[PDB]
């Protein structure tokens, strides 16, 4: 591997051109050799010399690696000459080839990206090669969300974060603008996919540098969901939303995804529900004592017994699916979490009344007495969870109401909800208006527009 440098480094470009041509030809000839095994069309047929070598084995990997690593000698300073095939452009001419089938190989894409990043670290942006500063972003945006292995986003995101620090180190490059206006659009997609907890930080910090501001709406929609990931990405999302800009918060793209996910989850009736697991959820909603010491993520993957939802699973989606499953499990006659139906209903009514009266009064209880920071804010979370629980229960408690296509039939027990009438308890326990108007206003009209209308 030293002879390649010893041949391509010295002067007398008359011979360096031949050395390059030969190496690049061996490369662009081995690369298509894996085409037959992949059944792909031969491409990159522009630098190949007259050498029809037939490797047809793992030798292609090593040959391409040695022919690309040798090119680093030209992609390193100083090298005040560009009479060759412009390796700067060579690493991009093979994009459509070594990036569309690179998955089936997963050996050449990363090496090409590393060589390109090395060639760019010595010179990244100056405005002679001029479109380079724009070709970098134009190739990154295309190679940034062609979903690949974890060993690729970890370097693409790193190069992007390193280029962001140079953009704000330049200066009118922001108005390019087909690259930046898309380089940031792809950052928006890479902020969540994939769920690695390492690429998001490389994106939350890479996009935190840009002001920008072109499409901060997508950044705000991403932060509105990432602020609850329950991982170290929460702090990054918070610091990005507090530093990007105001008046656009306060301005839908991502929230609709969670809405559709919950709508699709509420239309399957997967009656696994881990009845024993619903107790540790009521103990977390009606009480602060957490029985599962993250624990929510270990629940969704446990539920639904495959063999649904996206790969996000963090965290409002799972936080709401837990309550929905607990409600589906309480829909059956007996609520194993508590005593018989008349006991669980009484417990819920008491927990709601002891908290609604707290509004026009002052009283201490496990819903507000939190003797630690970051937990008194969980009391509001408890109220929101209880409100959503009651709402989705009234949803699934319509076995007598005969829910429409929005919710499939509950089960063969669709008669117990018709024989027995729980609407009487809902009417006699409409104190949820007070216990809801405090945490979430809209959590009362759902019940307020019923008790206030049923009593015509």
């Amino acid at each position: 591997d030293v002879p390649p440098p010893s041949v391509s480094l010295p002067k007398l470009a008359a011979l360096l051109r031949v050395f390059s041509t030969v190496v690049r030809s061996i490369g662009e000839r081995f690369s298509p050799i894996r085409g037959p095994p992949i059944t792909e069309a031969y491409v990159t047929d522009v630098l190949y010399r007259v050498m029809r070598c037939v490797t047809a084995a793992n030798q292609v990997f090593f040959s391409e690696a040695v022919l690309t690593a040798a090119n680093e000698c030209v992609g390193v300073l100083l090298g005040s000459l560009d009479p060759s095939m412009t390796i700067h452009c060579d690493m991009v001419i093979t994009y459509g080839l070594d990036q569309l089938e690179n998955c089936q190989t997963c050996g050449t894409d990363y090496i090409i990206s590393v060589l390109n990043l090395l060639t760019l670290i010595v010179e990244q942006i100056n405005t002679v090669v001029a479109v380079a500063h724009a070709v970098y972003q134009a190739v990154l945006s295309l190679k940034n969300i062609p979903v690949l292995e974890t060993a690729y986003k970890l370097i693409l995101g790193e190069m992007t974060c390193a280029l962001n620090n140079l953009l704000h180190s330049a200066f009118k490059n922001h108005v390019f603008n087909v690259d930046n206006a898309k380089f940031v659009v792809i950052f928006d997609l890479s902020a969540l996919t994939t769920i690695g907890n390492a690429k998001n930080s490389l994106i939350g910090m890479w996009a935190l540098s840009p002001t920008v501001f072109a499409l901060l709406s997508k950044n705000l929609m991403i932060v509105h969901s990432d602020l609850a990931v329950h991982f170290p990405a929460i702090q990054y999302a918070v610091l990005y939303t507090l530093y990007s800009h105001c008046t656009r918060h306060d301005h839908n793209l991502l929230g609709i995804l969670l809405k559709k996910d919950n709508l699709n989850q509420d239309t399957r009736k997967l009656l696994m529900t881990w009845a024993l697991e619903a107790a540790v959820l009521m103990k977390k909603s009606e009480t602060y004592a957490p029985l599962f010491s993250c624990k929510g993520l270990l629940a969704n993957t446990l539920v639904e017994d495959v063999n649904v939802c996206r790969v996000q699973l963090v965290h409002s989606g799972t936080r709401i699916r837990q309550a929905f499953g607990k409600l589906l499990k309480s829909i059956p006659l007996d609520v194993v979490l508590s005593n018989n139906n008349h006991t669980e209903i009484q417990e819920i009514s008491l927990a709601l009344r002891s908290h609604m009266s707290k509004a026009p009064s002052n009283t201490f209880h496990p819903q507000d007495f939190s003797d630690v920071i970051s937990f008194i804010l969980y009391g509001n979370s408890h109220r929101t969870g209880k409100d959503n629980w009651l709402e989705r229960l009234f949803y699934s408690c319509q076995r007598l109401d005969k829910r429409d296509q929005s919710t499939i039939p509950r089960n063969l027990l669709k008669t117990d909800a018709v024989l027995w009438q729980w609407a009487i308890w809902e009417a006699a326990q409409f104190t949820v208006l007070s216990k809801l108007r405090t945490p979430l206003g809209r959590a009362q009209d759902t019940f307020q527009t019923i008790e206030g209308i049923i009593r015509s």
Partner: protein, 115 residues
């Protein structure tokens, strides 16, 4: 529900100004996600529903019993009646933008206004 009420009010104002008819439980769809109401092809428009051939109905839009019970309280003096007034105000203020559009849609060549 708010997005629903708003789209319902706007479509009602449209069917009042434009003679939209044939409003059945199929032509008046509903987006359970966004809550907005979509209407099927306006085969009976510009008061054509008063020329049949069919029991002459004179509803300016669909306000059935399964729709008035959808808003907060009702239709008249409700969230929908408060937005229809704003719709008319924003449309009367730009009444020319629609008058000229209709004048150019009429006296046409391949529009087939013989319905």
């Amino acid at each position: 529900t708010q997005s629903y009420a708003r789209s319902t009010a706007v479509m009602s104002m449209v069917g009042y100004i434009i003679g939209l008819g044939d409003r059945h439980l199929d032509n008046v769809l509903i987006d359970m996600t966004t809550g907005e109401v979509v209407h099927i092809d306006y085969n009976v428009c510009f008061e054509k529903g008063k020329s049949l051939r069919v029991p002459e109905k004179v509803p300016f839009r669909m306000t059935q019993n399964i729709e008035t019970a959808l808003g907060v309280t009702g239709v008249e003096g409700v969230f929908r009646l408060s937005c229809e007034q704003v719709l008319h105000i924003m449309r009367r203020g730009r009444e020319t933008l629609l008058t000229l559009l209709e004048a150019f849609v009429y006296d046409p060549l391949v529009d087939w206004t013989a319905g």
